[PDB]
Design a protein around this ligand. Sequence first.
Ligand SMILES: CS(=O)(=O)c1ccccc1-c1ccc(NC(=O)c2cc(C(F)(F)F)nn2-c2cccc(CN)c2)c(F)c1
Ligand SMILES: [Ca+2]
Length: 223
Amino acid sequence: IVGGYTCGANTVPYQVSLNSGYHFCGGSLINSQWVVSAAHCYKSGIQVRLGEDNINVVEGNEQFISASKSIVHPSYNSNTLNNDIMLIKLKSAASLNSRVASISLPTSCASAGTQCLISGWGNTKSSGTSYPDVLKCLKAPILSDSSCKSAYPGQITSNMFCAGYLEGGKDSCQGDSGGPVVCSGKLQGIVSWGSGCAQKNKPGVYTKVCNYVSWIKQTIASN
Ligand SMILES: CS(=O)(=O)c1ccccc1-c1ccc(NC(=O)c2cc(C(F)(F)F)nn2-c2cccc(CN)c2)c(F)c1
Ligand SMILES: [Ca+2]
């Protein structure tokens, strides 16, 4: 997160950290056994870390659970980043509490202007790289599709939306990928991609979760 603020220990209870000897992506807990992340975050040997704040120090509320299965959307295209969503099943259910909770799936899509909370342990610099120890937050609005497509001619599909600031300075960045975009208590997006970070006229692009609600539910029901 570039130009954001320190969330505060466990203030984003649904935020998870995907770990493989180091933090490489974020994710969202949608129920006791399932996490939603980005398809391009996929890899083997994934350990899901819940109830995290400072990802480098054991503080007391962490729950480390191995992924028993990772389901990348069958129509995910790595060349266009279309359908950039993945479901991860935990080996055992997580113990839900005040510091570890699930986030609700949307029942309808969000509209332009809607204010959302984006979080992650991603890079905090627009120029160069420097990762934080604690979880970072950023409040950002969903932009109109016109502005989104004007910024990224020919690269925006109906399964993506832009959110952020055209003036630059505040944006999600590498390391935030797979993380949540919550609006009015609903997970509306997944950190996917963007041209650099916090760059002018280059807002972040996010996976439009509302288009995948049926797919998600039918998939977890079958696994
Ligand atoms: C495969 S294509 O290029 O032909 C391509 C083809 C078609 C559609 C989309 C892409 C595409 C473009 C840029 C990127 N690059 C990034 O998305 C990125 C870079 C960095 C850093 F290197 F740090 F500059 N961070 N970063 C990023 C990560 C998460 C969120 C956000 C948001 N602000 C940005 C990417 F992956 C995919
Ligand atoms: Ca920790």
